[PDB]
Amino acid sequence: VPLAVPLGQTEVFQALQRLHMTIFSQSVSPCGKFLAAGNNYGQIAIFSLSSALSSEAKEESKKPVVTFQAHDGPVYSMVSTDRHLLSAGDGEVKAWLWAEMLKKGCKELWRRQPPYRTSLEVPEINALLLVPKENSLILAGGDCQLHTMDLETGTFTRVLRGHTDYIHCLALRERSPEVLSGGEDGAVRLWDLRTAKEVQTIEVYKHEECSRPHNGRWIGCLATDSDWMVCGGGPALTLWHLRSSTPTTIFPIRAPQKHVTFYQDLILSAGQGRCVNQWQLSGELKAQVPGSSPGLLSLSLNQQPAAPECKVLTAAGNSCRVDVFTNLGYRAFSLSF
Amino acid sequence: SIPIDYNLYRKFWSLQDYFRNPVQCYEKISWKTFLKYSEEVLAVFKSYKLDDKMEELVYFAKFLTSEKLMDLQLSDSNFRRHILLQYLILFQYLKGNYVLTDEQSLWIEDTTKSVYQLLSENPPDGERFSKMVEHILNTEENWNSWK
Amino acid sequence: VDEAKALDDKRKEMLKRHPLSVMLDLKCKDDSVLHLTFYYLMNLNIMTVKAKVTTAMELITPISAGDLLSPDSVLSCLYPGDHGKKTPNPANQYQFDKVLSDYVLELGHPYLWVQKLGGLHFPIADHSLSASHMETTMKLLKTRVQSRLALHKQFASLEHGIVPVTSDCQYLFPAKVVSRLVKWVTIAHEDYMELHFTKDIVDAGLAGDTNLYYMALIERGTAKLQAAVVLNPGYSSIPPIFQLCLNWKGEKTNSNDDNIRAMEGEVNVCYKELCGPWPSHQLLTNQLQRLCVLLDVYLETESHKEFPQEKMCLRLFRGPSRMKPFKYNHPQGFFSHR
Amino acid sequence: YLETESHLRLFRGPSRMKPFKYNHGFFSHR
Numbered sequence: 001v002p003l004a005v006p007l008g009q010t011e012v013f014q015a016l017q018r019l020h021m022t023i024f025s026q027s028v029s030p031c032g033k034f035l036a037a038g039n040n041y042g043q044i045a046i047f048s049l050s051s052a053l054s055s056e057a058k059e060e061s062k063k064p065v066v067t068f069q070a071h072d073g074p075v076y077s078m079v080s081t082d083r084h085l086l087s088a089g090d091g092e093v094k095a096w097l098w099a100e101m102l103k104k105g106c107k108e109l110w111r112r113q114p115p116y117r118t119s120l121e122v123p124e125i126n127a128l129l130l131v132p133k134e135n136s137l138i139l140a141g142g143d144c145q146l147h148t149m150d151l152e153t154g155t156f157t158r159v160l161r162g163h164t165d166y167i168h169c170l171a172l173r174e175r176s177p178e179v180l181s182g183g184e185d186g187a188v189r190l191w192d193l194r195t196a197k198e199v200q201t202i203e204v205y206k207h208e209e210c211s212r213p214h215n216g217r218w219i220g221c222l223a224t225d226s227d228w229m230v231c232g233g234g235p236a237l238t239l240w241h242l243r244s245s246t247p248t249t250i251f252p253i254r255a256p257q258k259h260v261t262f263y264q265d266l267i268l269s270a271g272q273g274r275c276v277n278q279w280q281l282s283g284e285l286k287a288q289v290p291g292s293s294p295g296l297l298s299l300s301l302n303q304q305p306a307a308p309e310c311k312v313l314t315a316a317g318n319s320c321r322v323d324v325f326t327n328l329g330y331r332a333f334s335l336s337f
Numbered sequence: 338s339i340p341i342d343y344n345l346y347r348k349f350w351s352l353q354d355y356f357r358n359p360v361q362c363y364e365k366i367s368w369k370t371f372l373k374y375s376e377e378v379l380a381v382f383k384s385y386k387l388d389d390k391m392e393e394l395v396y397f398a399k400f401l402t403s404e405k406l407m408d409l410q411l412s413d414s415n416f417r418r419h420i421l422l423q424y425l426i427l428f429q430y431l432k433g434n435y436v437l438t439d440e441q442s443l444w445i446e447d448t449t450k451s452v453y454q455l456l457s458e459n460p461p462d463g464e465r466f467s468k469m470v471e472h473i474l475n476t477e478e479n480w481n482s483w484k
Numbered sequence: 485v486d487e488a489k490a491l492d493d494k495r496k497e498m499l500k501r502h503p504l505s506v507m508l509d510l511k512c513k514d515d516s517v518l519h520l521t522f523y524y525l526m527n528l529n530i531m532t533v534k535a536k537v538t539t540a541m542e543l544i545t546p547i548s549a550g551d552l553l554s555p556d557s558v559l560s561c562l563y564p565g566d567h568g569k570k571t572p573n574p575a576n577q578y579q580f581d582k583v584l585s586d587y588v589l590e591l592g593h594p595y596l597w598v599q600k601l602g603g604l605h606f607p608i609a610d611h612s613l614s615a616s617h618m619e620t621t622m623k624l625l626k627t628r629v630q631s632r633l634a635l636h637k638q639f640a641s642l643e644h645g646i647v648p649v650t651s652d653c654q655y656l657f658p659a660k661v662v663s664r665l666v667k668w669v670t671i672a673h674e675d676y677m678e679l680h681f682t683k684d685i686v687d688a689g690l691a692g693d694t695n696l697y698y699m700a701l702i703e704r705g706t707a708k709l710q711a712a713v714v715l716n717p718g719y720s721s722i723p724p725i726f727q728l729c730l731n732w733k734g735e736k737t738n739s740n741d742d743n744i745r746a747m748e749g750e751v752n753v754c755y756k757e758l759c760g761p762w763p764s765h766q767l768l769t770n771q772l773q774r775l776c777v778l779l780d781v782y783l784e785t786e787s788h789k790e791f792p793q794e795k796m797c798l799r800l801f802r803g804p805s806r807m808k809p810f811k812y813n814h815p816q817g818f819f820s821h822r
Numbered sequence: 823y824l825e826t827e828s829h830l831r832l833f834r835g836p837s838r839m840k841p842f843k844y845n846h847g848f849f850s851h852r
Contacts (some may be wrong), residue, residue: 001686002687002688002691002692003685003687003689004689004691005565005689005690005692006689006690007564007565008564009564009718009721011721012690012722015688015689015690016725016752016753017753019685019688019752020745020749020752020753022745022805023740024804026820051343053340055341055343055404057343057344074803076803076804090429121799121820122796123802124803126803126804141801142802165803166801168804184806212722216787218806220804258804260719264372272740275495287386289384290384294738294739294740295742296371297804297805308338308339308340309338309339310340310342311339311340312340318742318745326340326341326342327342327408327411329384329385329386329411330381330384330385331342331758332345333344796830796848798848815829818830
């Protein structure tokens, strides 16, 4: 079972870094062919996903084709555009080109840092929201404030102040409020971009159907179906009806859930457990597919045009490896960092 | 195109080639590949968990060794029944040179007790079918004792 | 010089020691000496070594010292690996196949560095092959004996529940500490692999046979922390690896908690902050003291109250994993996040 | 006055002032 024994100070240190690695973020290329994984140590790996899914595939094809140090602190969030890869690291966002990150140069385009309260902590950036219909980017983190940045020029337009503690996740549903934000304070807030005000607040811990005071009050994940909402984290995995703010159904699971998304007609979830949780919208546990990590922090559906062969579900968390699901009942393989 | 797990394809039909020639399961390296591939395939069978009134709502004679399908067969229960029955026929044949390691015999007994549990987990009448398989394999031992 | 002038019987005459042997001893700056006796096997073309570490004092040994200075396994892994077990040249393996560890304990260990000292090149003795390898191996022996004597002193102190910290390392830690070490007992390999919370070290390939396996137990009020420790014999060049299991409420282990994994990252991966001067043989005590500090932080900064929070952390959680502050800042004396 | 007397910052200003303002949870100067 111990196949590779390191036998050397550098290789023992590399085995210790791989053993203590956490993969926070995932991003996909504009084509389906590439994957990007953010690191505990501020590194970024680039995964040739089409080469891994090919018929000709080697054991060294499940390795980063380019990995590079990109931030001083951990990479908590990535997002991708038509041409760029935006990565939020220590307290600032860097931008990378997909054409140049495969080459030997690996230079950055810009480096933008939002204005702060000048406290001596240099707060994090937990969630990156890429807004269509206008070239914009929403920053959220330990400043407890939502910053809006233009993508063309590095100017910060709106600052939104509704939360008490820091923010974990953002959302988008293309209507009049159009922006959800959930945080450590325990309330999902709605942020109309035109008036730059808060229009609705849903406190999930106040409702006794959802409370669970043992884990605490923190909202880790949000999801939108433009009429519905899935809110999870500390309290419970709950299905809310927007414009009513009523808890419709509860998903009966013990472990706290760090990420949630809408599938075609399923609910995908992952958290402190080992497995990926597939729910039905009524509230019935359809499946639990075991992964290779003891806990998961990120899911990604690679639903991109011009590459139908790169249509997989990728999962990552408290490990140095990424589980790739070519089908939703079993893992096909795993990409080492 | 549709994304295809080629590794499960290659390991599964290499197991099929091992079923077609039962003499090959007496060397070292071929048996080790049989151990790895069979445990991986039975792990996939345990972890998929069909749990199927769908059948209440032209005959295919041979197996369809096609790269592109590979998932419509895993969603079926008859295909799983054919593969688990083929495992049980191979294990009943190996119980009848040509020596076996005691560790191999313990592995055969563990995998046999797992395959009977997997046949009990088929949704149409797994227990009755498992009892039928047990009685038929006992009578196959009685038939093989004659010839 | 008279013997030098010149089927168990075949095994004895095959493992025939040459009547002439060489004996070299070093004295270190700890009023202690290392004695090496090199023996030769003319039927195998392999030379071996017996070793003996002796100090000037009586050397009152503790219980958990054990295989530190035991002459079977002192010089086992000077270079990374080499195991002291297998013969280097495969021609001798084919010759012994035509016809061993008890004879290794009887005769000595056929290392690779010993045969490079002799001049034997295994893919006729050469002085040019012996030249640089001589100085490098003598420096490595001088570091190895000093490291084992320093570990002996540290273990003699750690069996009394006291973590020996030096006057130099005091800036690495805060002043007040509450958690203390109550048990330090060496365990066996199989006893290490029987533990449920050490599967990752074994599966990574770090729990080999040639290691020293220890169990530390650190407590506060109804709070018990089992820390399994792996040392490979290249200490002060390769750090000990720790695994943590906190039996405080239920069983908070590495698989169901992320702050346990954060403390393991603070001890194992960031070990170069804890190494001091050039003879950095104080690394294990610095890791144990930092792990005591981390247990204090994990118990005080947990939100609800059996343990009052006296830390000046100024922010309790950050990041997606809700991380506790585990980095210490000495000139202002406060805890930040990593 | 009793704890911060010498045998995040202890003194400032020409008069060497001790931190007496509370922040609801650390002490700064006025």
